[PDB]
Enzyme design. Structure first.
Site, mmCIF file in Angstrom:
data_model
loop_
_atom_site.group_PDB
_atom_site.id
_atom_site.type_symbol
_atom_site.label_atom_id
_atom_site.label_comp_id
_atom_site.label_asym_id
_atom_site.label_seq_id
_atom_site.Cartn_x
_atom_site.Cartn_y
_atom_site.Cartn_z
ATOM 1 N N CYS A 1 -16.960 57.831 26.423
ATOM 2 C CA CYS A 1 -16.498 58.597 27.287
ATOM 3 C C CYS A 1 -16.088 59.256 26.252
ATOM 4 O O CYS A 1 -15.290 61.000 27.150
ATOM 5 C CB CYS A 1 -15.341 57.640 27.460
ATOM 6 S SG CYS A 1 -15.974 56.848 29.642
ATOM 7 N N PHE B 1 -18.017 54.197 37.075
ATOM 8 C CA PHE B 1 -18.888 55.159 36.317
ATOM 9 C C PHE B 1 -19.917 55.376 37.262
ATOM 10 O O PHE B 1 -20.614 54.769 38.218
ATOM 11 C CB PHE B 1 -19.333 54.032 35.206
ATOM 12 C CG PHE B 1 -19.131 53.549 34.055
ATOM 13 C CD1 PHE B 1 -18.540 54.884 33.252
ATOM 14 C CD2 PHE B 1 -18.874 52.224 33.761
ATOM 15 C CE1 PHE B 1 -17.570 54.280 32.571
ATOM 16 C CE2 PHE B 1 -18.418 51.628 32.690
ATOM 17 C CZ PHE B 1 -17.869 52.413 31.707
ATOM 18 N N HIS C 1 -10.684 63.686 30.220
ATOM 19 C CA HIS C 1 -12.211 63.461 30.503
ATOM 20 C C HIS C 1 -11.351 62.145 32.005
ATOM 21 O O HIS C 1 -10.310 61.474 31.563
ATOM 22 C CB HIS C 1 -11.867 61.650 29.676
ATOM 23 C CG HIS C 1 -12.742 61.074 30.169
ATOM 24 N ND1 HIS C 1 -14.176 60.660 30.323
ATOM 25 C CD2 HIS C 1 -13.151 59.313 30.470
ATOM 26 C CE1 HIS C 1 -14.603 60.353 30.940
ATOM 27 N NE2 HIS C 1 -13.714 59.141 30.461
ATOM 28 N N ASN D 1 -16.769 58.509 37.347
ATOM 29 C CA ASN D 1 -16.194 58.602 35.754
ATOM 30 C C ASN D 1 -17.915 58.318 34.893
ATOM 31 O O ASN D 1 -17.921 58.368 34.974
ATOM 32 C CB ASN D 1 -15.208 57.358 35.302
ATOM 33 C CG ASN D 1 -15.988 57.529 33.371
ATOM 34 O OD1 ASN D 1 -16.682 58.176 33.144
ATOM 35 N ND2 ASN D 1 -14.242 56.446 32.937
#
Lengths: 378, 378
Positions: free
Chosen positions: A151, A202, A294, A327
């Site tokens: 990530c 995700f 992020h 994400n």
């Protein structure tokens, strides 16, 4: 002068949208787990507090029905997952890269380097090669292929491109990160509750940059990369593990990741803020910087915002990406960079970084590793 | 000058030696393929002309008997291959890195960057992280993890380290490549005759470099890196494919790699030789250069030697590594770099590159991709 500069950003997602409010229904149905009522209820609560409105996925009911191994918890299924990821990761990257190349406005022949990041599949030749071929770039473009990164890799590829651009006169670096969750999707299990976190968060997506030093008057700079660092956080061993197995990519979460990041974030930033003091002769507050973070999940953002006493708007670009895409692992922070520029236009800001001069880009990944970059707006 | 300089090289192999003369007996016995008499004859012929005297392997009869899936042709086996490779690849790299660090002579705390290459397994956190931990490097060492790269990656990591060292004052880059063939070992099959090539050539090994610009008076340069390039050769699509599957890493060889390389090698070398002409105002013959070539197999070396009209001694360092260790994938060309320096001491040469000023480092991999670096001896 001379600093690696972002000259364009493009993004792409798979077309099919999955509403987060009803994703538990879809997920427990397609994995034949409807009898797991209490687990579904937990998953619904996780999704409801995830900060996500929708996600985009290549995987759909048809593909999953065609490949029942992927609908199991730990059934052998890497071969089909690889078939999907090795094909679709470069295709999604191509869409993003074409958008970045259009924005840049120069011919593709002027690209001298290509840096490709992913956590979704591996192959030889790699996705970097496939992207080179799909775009018809020169055969002597210098490539760096970053596989199985996680990530933090959107920040990593930016750090890598910075040294390429700065050390090579005239270099123009195409950066691409692309993620397809075909390698991680699997059935929910009471024995793998940390798996519910990834299942809630995700999503798929790709992003591309053009980076170069010494922009010409026909190029249009967006952000300058002034400083870059990477570090392993203390007392974080084993916080996030990811193993590539016959069942695909499996994650394990063993420590309080938002807490570890928040405990250390001030110390992380000391070095880039000393760079700023060297240049400007004063110390900004954390809330005097713009933030390109992020969006690992809502708790990381909430805890960093609280620890650093950021005005609520500082995390908005990050939260907007989380809300619309989830994400997207390595690509996600590059979507945030794009959203930062986009809101600068729509909100009539004086700079590309929320009207502020200096900004911080953060990526987080296994280690626990934090990538930090100091940005200057334009 | 400021050019990136190789300051140390260290190498390491697994302890167990496998004589190439008797490897066919071991290989066909342990995979229970002794009834394939004609196939074994073909394999013995391949081994006998391989240019290899011995190879070193972590895999042995005990491990293979414990895990009979690795003794099948295409049986499920990735989980055990990953268990081995994820553990043993950083361990082997640590041995090579300690040797490089000793030669360098400086404290480990002065390492600022770590570039790790492998084709043997993938994990999160990566082998780079594991090596950082095993060596007790500073937690803010900047890492680049190059997974699933193939046989060109020893040159790739050198190219990556060049820009790190040159763009970052004081930077000292630890480069490590490490390969364990547990991911590719499998039973021989009459339906996968190209698999016999890898079974005959690939061996285990790790190598490490320290690279830095502006060496201090207590450092001891070995080679300077003056020019780097990477290119896909024409008409080579699909020559080498490498797929990571539930059965481990499977290679397919579909075109004539030695012929494609030799058809294009003169063109490849035009740009680095133009660089030499810019600096030295002179045009060396190919045989006036020293050669640090990936020993992919004997045919590549023989055909390049003939095409470029090299004196037979020019390929000797490369052939010495092939003879003693086999094709160790990404690490192999770094062994050749060490052997070039070793023979310069033992044969009383005037420079570290066989008494010559300029040298060519070549890696080869899927693409078909060639990595080319121009070296200057010390």
């Amino acid at each position: 002068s001379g600093k690696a500069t972002v000259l364009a950003v493009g993004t792409a997602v798979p077309p099919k949208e999955f509403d987060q409010s009803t994703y538990p229904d879809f997920y427990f149905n397609v994995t034949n787990c409807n009898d797991k009522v209490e687990l579904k209820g937990k998953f619904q609560r996780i999704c409801d507090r995830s900060g996500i409105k929708k996600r985009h996925f290549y995987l759909d009911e048809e593909i999953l029905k065609a490949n029942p191994g992927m609908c199991t918890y730990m059934g052998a299924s890497l071969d089909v997952r690889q078939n999907i990821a090795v094909r679709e990761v470069p295709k999604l990257a191509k869409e993003a890269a074409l958008k970045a190349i259009k924005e840049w406005g120069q011919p593709k022949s002027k690209i001298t380097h290509l840096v490709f990041g992913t956590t979704s599949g591996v192959d030889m030749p790699g996705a970097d090669f496939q992207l080179l071929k799909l775009l018809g770039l020169r055969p002597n473009v210098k490539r760096i292929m970053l596989y199985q990164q996680g990530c933090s890799a959107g920040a990593t590829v930016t750090r890598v491109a910075k040294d390429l651009a700065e050390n090579n006169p005239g270099a123009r670096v195409l950066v691409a990160c692309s993620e397809v969750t075909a390698v991680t999707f699997r059935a929910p299990s009471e024995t793998h509750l940390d798996g519910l976190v990834g299942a809630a968060l995700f999503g798929d997506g790709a992003a591309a940059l053009i980076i170069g030093s010494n922009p010409t008057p026909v190029e249009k700079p967006l952000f300058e990369v002034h400083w870059s660092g990477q570090c392993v956080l203390p007392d974080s061993d084993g916080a996030i593990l990811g193993h590539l197995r016959e069942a695909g990519l499996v994650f394990h979460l063993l420590k309080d990741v938002p807490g570890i990041i928040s405990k250390n974030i001030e110390k992380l930033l000391a070095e880039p803020l000393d760079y700023v003091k060297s240049v400007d002769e004063a110390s900004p507050a954390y809330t005097d910087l713009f933030w390109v973070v992020h969006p690992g999940g809502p708790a990381i953002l909430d805890q960093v915002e609280a620890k650093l006493k950021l005005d609520k708007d500082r995390m908005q670009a990050t939260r907007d990406v989380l809300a619309q895409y989830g994400n997207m692992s390595s690509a996600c922070v590059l979507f945030v960079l794009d959203q930062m520029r986009k809101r600068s236009v729509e909100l009539n800001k004086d700079t590309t970084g929320d009207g502020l001069k200096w900004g911080v880009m953060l990526g987080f990944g296994p280690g626990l590793t934090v990538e930090t970059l100091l940005l200057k707006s334009i």
